[PDB]
Amino acid sequence: ISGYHIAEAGANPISQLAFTLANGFTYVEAYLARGMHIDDFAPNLSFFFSNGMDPEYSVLGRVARRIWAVTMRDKYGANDRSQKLKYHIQTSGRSLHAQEIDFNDIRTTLQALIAIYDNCNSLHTNAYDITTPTAESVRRALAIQLIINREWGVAKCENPNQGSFLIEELTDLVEEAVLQEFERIAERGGVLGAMETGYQRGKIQEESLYYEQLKHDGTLPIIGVNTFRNPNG
Amino acid sequence: RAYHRRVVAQSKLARERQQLRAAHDMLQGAGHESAALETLASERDVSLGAVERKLLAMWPQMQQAYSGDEYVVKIRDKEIRTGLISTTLSGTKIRKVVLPRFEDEGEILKWLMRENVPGSFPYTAGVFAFKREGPTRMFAGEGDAFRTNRRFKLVSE
Amino acid sequence: RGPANKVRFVTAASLFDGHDASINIMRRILQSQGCEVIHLGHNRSVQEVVTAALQEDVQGIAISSYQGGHVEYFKYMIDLLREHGGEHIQVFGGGGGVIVPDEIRELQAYGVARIYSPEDGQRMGLAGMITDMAQRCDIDLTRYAPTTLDTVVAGDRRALAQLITALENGKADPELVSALHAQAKAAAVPVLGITGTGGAGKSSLTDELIRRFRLDQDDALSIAVISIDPSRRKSGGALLGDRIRMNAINHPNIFMRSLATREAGSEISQALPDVIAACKAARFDLVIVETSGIGQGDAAIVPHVDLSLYVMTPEFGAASQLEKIDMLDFADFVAINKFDRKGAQDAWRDVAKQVQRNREQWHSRAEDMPVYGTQASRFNDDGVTMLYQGLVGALGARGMSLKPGTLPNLEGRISTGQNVIVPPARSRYLAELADTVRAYHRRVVAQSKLARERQQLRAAHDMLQGAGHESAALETLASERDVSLGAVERKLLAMWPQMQQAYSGDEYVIRTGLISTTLSGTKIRKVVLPRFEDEGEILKWLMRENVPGSFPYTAGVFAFKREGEDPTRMFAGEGDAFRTNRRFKLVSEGMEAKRLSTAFDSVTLYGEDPHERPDIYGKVGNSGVSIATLEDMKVLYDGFDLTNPSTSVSMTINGPAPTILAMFMNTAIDQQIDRFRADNGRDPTADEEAKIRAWVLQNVRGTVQADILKEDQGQNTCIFSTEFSLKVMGDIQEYFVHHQVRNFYSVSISGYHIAEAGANPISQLAFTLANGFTYVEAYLARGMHIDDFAPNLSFFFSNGMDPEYSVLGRVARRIWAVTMRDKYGANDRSQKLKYHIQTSGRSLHAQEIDFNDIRTTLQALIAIYDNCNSLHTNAYDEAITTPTAESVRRALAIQLIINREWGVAKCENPNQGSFLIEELTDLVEEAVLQEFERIAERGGVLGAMETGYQRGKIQEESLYYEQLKHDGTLPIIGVNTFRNPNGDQTLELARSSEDEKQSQLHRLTEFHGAHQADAEAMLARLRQAVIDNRNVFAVLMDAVRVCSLGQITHALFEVGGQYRRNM
Ligand code: B12
Ligand SMILES: CC(C)(C)C(=O)SCCNC(=O)CCNC(=O)[C@H](O)C(C)(C)COP(=O)(O)OP(=O)(O)OC[C@H]1O[C@@H](n2cnc3c(N)ncnc32)[C@H](O)[C@@H]1OP(=O)(O)O
Ligand SMILES: Nc1nc2c(ncn2[C@@H]2O[C@H](COP(=O)(O)OP(=O)(O)O)[C@@H](O)[C@H]2O)c(=O)[nH]1
Ligand SMILES: C[C@H]1O[C@@H](n2cnc3c(N)ncnc32)[C@H](O)[C@@H]1O
Ligand SMILES: [Mg+2]
Ligand SMILES: [Mg+2]
Hints:
This is part of a larger assembly, with three copies of chain A.
Chain A: H1 4-8, H2 13-32, E1 46-51, H3 60-74, H4 80-83, E2 86-91, H5 104-117, E3 122-124, H6 137-150, H7 165-186, H8 190-197, H9 199-217
Helix pairs in contact in A: 2-7, 3-7, 5-6
């Protein structure tokens, strides 16, 4: 179950997480209605998210894990292996730009950091470059993970997020926001019923436009793009 | 939402249960023996769920586990020891998993139910106990099957 | 086994260079491999290093040059060596990434043996370089030794230096030796021996005495100095550390040779009588011999000299110990040095009476004995002069023609240096502070236990009444704890619900927004409050880590971060004042708040004017802006309203800090004078100008570093003596108080420099806070209200990769706030510690420079998370050059991305709550307190510096780190692991234009010509300000108007002395 494309298309972190978990639960309900046991396909389910600059991304993983674990235990009565949501996080490619490509390593570092902090299962790091994935560009991207995992001091702790007032409050907020979105999809006939109306497509498109607007508006600052621009070009 | 409602209620119970027994021990330290407190306390032992009661019960044993320099856990017939400490150039012991220092059993249970340690339900801080030591997949795909295969063999040499 | 021959080295840092961290860990490996190392320390000209290497007759010279101008420097050295019979001496160098590959091939082609790049260090290893370096210099120098005394007696000092190397190694012909002693006997020159306990001040006193000789006799005396230091027989070589203390030996009439004992026991070289005889035959007017640290029953210097001088400190234990000291029975003079120490007076009366007893001169007064109380550390000490006057009279009777002196022929035996920085009563101030903090935390634990129990009781009381069974017995125990709780603590819990309602809404009623909404529609509160139910935890949190803007200000000294003025403040400085003024406008472009940070070139950092000599010329305008006159300073900040409320300038200067500050102040004043003359079309009257001038001083906003305590410990930019700098630094703060300069920071108490030298985060934080508290104790003993100077105290730290850096700021704030409140009883403005954080430069490398942006991002992040007051970000070409135009934008973008784009940053206290952060905060805090106790038991910060405790600990930690960086135990991506399969072009560099150098020279000579009349007069007034002990800075406010930086500095040298290096 992926959500990389959904976010990349323009969906904010809440929409991405909500739609993806919704899609995941859809597969579950689909397989169950084939008369299958929950402990037979749930441990095979893998997830795939995006990490951007938005605050919600910092707690995206932990929210996804809790919503899954609680529902898989209480609602579907599955075992421990099933309650464990494993996911891959890939840094936001949309968040990187063609103007001042050296700045992208800064953004890709910050995104890679909160991924590792939030104990992700798998991480991909984006290159600074538009151009083909040069062997030089891939090393700078690969070094970001190597530096954080090996050099960065805070990373030597495996649960540095836990305890933080900001993290716990954000976790609760995002979680509820996701649940509310579940209810919106549910009153549209489930995920399949919503797709019939193009609800998801519509909402993603709506948010992509809103982002692309504030970006041009100068309201949403992007360093090297709409502010602090290159004095040469 | 139902799960969280339970966390709030069970915390209120665990908190009150502690507050009562705490006051009971303080009265006996002054001389006054009022078992009226104990009745309300034992009343909340039943009010607490089976799962929740065991969570608070294992909390001191949990603290002793993540306290040492290693993490002893016996699977099958053998055991799997894991280091908890990484020491800095300054000589500071950085624990892999840092436990809270709450005194209130209401907060302890609340934390254990909402955000347990990595590798424990609801796996908020991770699905595994500790991170793996040492994974980078080898992606390749272009041209015909022959070229993609050669790249696969070359990278995975 | 070490080298085949007696291999000797001369090690130093280049001119106007403070970087000793590199050269210090090299002389350690050199010494351990069995080499005698004559360490000269930092800031050494070519004429200094070469003269040293020639007199010591070494095989090798090791120089570190991190300031640039290294090409000109090494070329000069190579040239000067060949010109003066030192062609066979090999020269080695290193400067990290500063010396680019092309310049290495150039210099090595010129004559330099080897210059090591950071890549060389990785491939060869630390020991590998020194092995290569030592094996090259493993040559026998006795072949260059003269066979006849013809050259030596004539006056050839180089032939003398080589003859000594022959005599010391015993390769000199027997018939030549006896012929030397024969002429040495007929020479009849006095030989003064100076012996004493270890570290008493034998070298320092020797230097001062020589200075007296020069000033008294107009440098007409030819003096030979033979200093002996003990040799570690384990390695084979030694650390001859006497020459480093000598500042008065830089003169053609002065010769000095450093000898190792070369025996694990004896305090004299086995060939000392030969070496002395060699100097006697070389027609020297006086020979002075310094021994090593001798015991109480040691006196091997007596039979070899004509006069002996025993040096001791007031600390010798009981008065009965003096009866065990053999040297008190032979010494012709006894110098009780360090007379500033406690119990110096009583120490003198014991030694005096003991000498009287040993000589059986009962018919004489005890005060008439040749026992003197000296303070060599003190410039122009009257005690030392008294000792000198005595030595002259003794040497006079022993056949030594000398002119009637020009010095104050005073009377007495004891120094009258009544100056004290920290009174011995307050000696254990750091320990008291440690107790103060620990006491505070003990209270938090107790008050929490009370608040918790109080709640638990009343909770149970309400639950019983809900069931029926009412027991007022509970309430009695509850009301009992209402009184147990303190007044302050009770109000804290009382305001907690009102506090929660405040940070809950969308605004903070002046009204401030609390909410920033994301693209998802999530409300991110600026300050996130805990949701604890336990009042024990609430109070515990309120006392240990309150919200930002509340005691103890752990999460920040201010309620909310500034709206427009970001903490960003980029360091800048290159070329002349004109070019840097462009870079200022580049950095501060697009920002309503102009926050400048000025970097000065190595020449200005050492208070020198730019000059034609290659020593200095090559360094002008490099590594920083070249500022020499007030006119340069004015140009530097042209177009910047310094008196504007949204404009702050941060100048990084230490040694000449008071002089530079006076220039800045005069600049800010002149700006408003020019602004008035334009808005009124007329010059302001004497009264109008007085009002303007006064107003400027009050509202001018900026920061001058000037932390001298860290100069001795870390940066080494101290030019005058440590005591004099502290004196003038106090003058500055007194000036500020008088003129109500309440917006400028008189000192940036730093630790960044200490850290980059090699100190781990704990050491950095501890030393810096210790230095800060030292200034506090110094000012308090000096008669200033704590609330008068504490709000003017600024801090500066480093942020590296280590875990402790994440909580460095919050720890510094709490330790300060608690101590300033409880211990010193200062007000709120004083309890608030404001600091600047700059990302670690040593954490960035020359290999794979693109990786540095990753590290600089992570470091910048935890700085902003921990609510820093000011932040500097390092460029990616950090290891190679001063930030290029393109390089400074990438560094500046790091802050812009985090502050604007990064989501978590929209919260202002994201650290708070974290189990890791709070545990780390507690650990680091206690670790700092323990270090306070270690410094306290060494006599405070000043007492520790006396032993070189800080410098020792820093250099040790620097070695430990470096041993691991090359090792691999400590992974560094792109350096010791994950290397490039290629091994990698030409990067743009920030060097100064030739035209810019000639510009600065022409501007200087033009400035000098302008005030040629008032120059000598003003400088004379300045020295009288020091002599009459008035306010130095007050005169500098006038001095910088007619005098250049160099003129002022050198004028102060005649009256304030020069810094004595401390290894
Ligand atoms: C630490 C440091 C400092 C510390 C110095 C602490 C101390 N007591 O030594 C502090 C913070 C005080 C400092 C201050 C300044 N510094 Co500084 N500093 C650095 C830094 C980060 C590393 C230098 C270092 O000590 N490295 C540790 C050594 C052991 O490693 P290495 O250099 O890679 O060396 C290896 C090999 O080359 C070999 N080698 C090196 N030297 C030698 C010598 C011998 C004899 C041998 C055999 C081998 C050898 O040994 C090592 C093996 O791995 C560099 C940037 C960088 N990362 O390169 C800037 C840097 C050198 N400093 C710089 C400047 C400009 C300054 C200042 C003048 C700034 C100012 N305007 O105020 C000040 C003032 C200095 C003064 N007091 O005069 C610039 C130089 C610019 C230029 N020359 O073009 C640099 C390059 C930073 C920059 N990018 O702007 N500095
Ligand atoms: C190694 C090497 C290279 C050699 C070096 O040493 S490089 C060294 C580089 N050094 C530096 O860059 C040092 C920089 N440090 C500083 O500038 C100095 O230490 C600094 C960092 C200390 C100077 O920083 P500032 O931004 O000017 O700010 P301020 O504290 O002066 O602020 C001045 C008033 O404005 C208000 N205010 C400010 N921020 C507020 C906020 N968030 N909320 C509310 N009000 C706020 C208050 O009224 C303040 O005054 P008061 O409280 O007395 O009423
Ligand atoms: N407090 C104090 N320290 C001094 C005095 N004279 C020298 N020192 C310091 O003592 C240390 C060692 O000095 P040094 O001359 O090398 O002693 P030596 O090893 O016996 O020759 C240095 O830190 C000096 O600054 C003094 O009169 N008072
Ligand atoms: C000592 C530290 O000071 C900084 N530094 C030194 N010189 C400059 C300069 N001209 N511009 C900017 N930063 C500088 C670097 O970050 C270095 O590591
Ligand atoms: Mg000495
Ligand atoms: Mg000595």
